[PDB]
Each structure stands twice: as structure tokens, then as C-alpha cells.
Amino acid sequence: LENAKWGVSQLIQFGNTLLSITERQDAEALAEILQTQGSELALQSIKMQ
Amino acid sequence: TIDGQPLSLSLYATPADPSMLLSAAITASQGGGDLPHAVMPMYRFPVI
């Protein structure tokens, strides 16, 4: 029971870490797509000037 | 003309377009670590 309790506490640690990694993944992908579309808007604004 | 001004108008060519700026995330590779030399302990399997 102590051994299985150890393994499942380590599984909880891994699941928390995986949730943190996938939310930071999605945050960084959002930052990248915002920068690309801001670059597109900047080119179009220069063409307007 | 009588004043010296032209009848056929001058050319106004198209200027250079604004370019699109480009960058790149170039990548490298460090290999995996070579696995070390194993050392036999003195304790049994649960302790170590």
C-alpha cells in the first residue's frame, strides 16, 4: 500500500506538470500568432501611410 | 508652350513596395549523454 501510494503520488506530480506544460504551450503559441498578425497589420499600415 | 511649359506631361513611375520582413528560428542538436559505468553497491535492492 505504501509502494502503490508512492507510485500514485508520483503520477499526480506528473499530471500536474503535464497540465502546466500544455497550458504554457498554448500561451506561447498564442503569443507567436499575435506577433505574426501584428506584423501583417504593420505592413498594411505602412502601405496606408 | 508660349511660356515654355510642356504640353506632354512627365512620367511619375511607381516607387518601391514595402517589403515583408523575414526571420528564422534556426536549430541545433546536442546528442544524448553516454551512459556511465555502473558500480555495484553494498545494500540490497529496496535500500539503494
Cell of A39: 506584423
- The nearest CA of chain B is from the CA of A31 a distance in Å of 15
- Cβ distance A48 to B20 under 8 Å? no
Cβ distance B20 to A43 less than 8 Å, yes or no, reads: yes
Cβ distance B18 to A47 less than 8 Å, yes or no, reads: yes
Contacts 24+ apart (CB under 8 A), B23-26: none
Resolution of the entry in angstroms: 2.8
Amino acid at A43: L
Cell of A5: 501510494
Alpha carbon B4 to its chain centroid, in Å, reads 56
Residues in chain B: 48
**Residue A30 and residue A25: Cα distance in Å, rounded?**
9
**Residue B26 and residue A32: Cα distance in Å, rounded?**
16
Method for structure elucidation: cryo-EM
Cell of A3: 509502494
